[PDB]
Amino acid sequence: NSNICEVCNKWGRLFCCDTCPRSFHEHCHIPSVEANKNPWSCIFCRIKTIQERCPESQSGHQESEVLMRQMLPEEQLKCEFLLLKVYCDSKSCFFASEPYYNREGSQGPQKPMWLNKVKTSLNEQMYTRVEGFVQDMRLIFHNHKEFYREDKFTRLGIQVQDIFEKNFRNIFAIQETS
Ligand SMILES: [Zn+2]
Ligand SMILES: [Zn+2]
Ligand SMILES: [Zn+2]
């Protein structure tokens, strides 16, 4: 197995996957690495299994259909993996914890949002449809773009949103378009 966490790329107290060489810190994995379970299979492995059991799940889908899906166990897992893929980028640090807003010439957002809040929301089964999760994820980057206006720091929101959207299209097998 790898000797660094797949998500944050640091060493430490690592839990190893039994079916692939990835390793994880306890709270870097989503969901947090389960207490017992031998063997244990990481979320990458669990997502690959879904795909293998239903090859047709990789045919193209419309976003509108995906968003209306109820959060049954497989869609819960897919949103957890998508959230983890965002954390895998180091620029996610900017969006992880609760933000605050005091900048001359800007007003803070009406509905602040952040990754750790989405994480808690998923853990507490607060989303009933994929749309709930995706709306909160997109709001993180929209709030950032609106608040930082012409500051070049706005680009960090564009960058991390792009990681989100690419992974959303991959995980949920959104139909490719130009
Ligand atoms: Zn880690
Ligand atoms: Zn694995
Ligand atoms: Zn099948």
Measured in whole angstroms, how far is the alpha carbon of residue 90 from the centre of its chain? 13
**How many domains does the chain fold into?**
2
Pair 87, 8 in one domain: no
Ligand located closest to 39 CA: 2
Q: Pick from 66, 83, 42: which is nearest to 130 by CA?
A: 66
C-alpha distance across the termini of the chain, in Å: 39
Give the ligand with the smallest distance to the CA of 19.
Answer: 2
Query: Cα(80) to centroid of ligand 2, in Å?
Result: 15
Residues 78 and 12 both lie in one domain: no
User: What is the DSSP code string of 45-95?
Assistant: HHHHHHHHH-GGGGS-B-HHHHHH-B--HHHHHHHHHHHHHHHTSGGGHHH
Whether 88 and 118 map to the same domain: the answer is yes
Q: Which of 10, 86, 85 is nearest to 42 (CA)?
A: 85
Distance in angstroms (rounded) separating the CA atoms of residues 119 and 112: 15
101: left (phi over 0), alpha (psi -120 to 50) or beta: beta
Closest CA relative to residue 6, chosen from 36, 16, 116, 77: 16
Kindly give, in sequence order, each residue whose CB lies less than 8 Å from that of residue 65, ignoring residues fewer than 6 positions away. Answer: none
Distance CA 75, CA 128 (A): 10
Do 130 and 168 have their domain in common? yes
Ligand 3 centre and the CA of 51: distance in Å?
9
6 C-alpha to ligand 1 centroid (Å): 7
Q: From ligand 2's centre to the CA of 139, what distance in Å?
A: 30
Is 72 found in the same domain as 23? no
Claim to verify: residue 93 and residue 177 sit in the same structural domain: yes
Which structural domain range is residue 40 located in? 1-59
Burial class of residue 90 in the structure, from the number of CB atoms within 10 Å of its CB (0-12 exposed, 13-18 middle, 19+ buried): exposed
How far apart are the C-alpha atoms of 27 and 47, rounded to whole Å? 19
Question: Helix axis angle, 130-148 relative to 154-171, nearest 10°?
Answer: 160
Among 14, 43, 59, give the residue marking a domain's end.
59
Method: X-ray
Cβ contact 17:44 at 8 Å: yes
Beta-strand relationship, 14-16 and 23-25? antiparallel
Using CA atoms, how far apart are residues 3 and 9, in angstroms rounded to an integer?
9
DSSP string for 25-48: ETTTSSSPPPSS-SS---HHHHHH
CATH number for the domain harbouring residue 54: 3.30.40.10
Kindly give the distance from the C-alpha atom of residue 53 to the centroid of ligand 3, in angstroms, as a whole number.
6
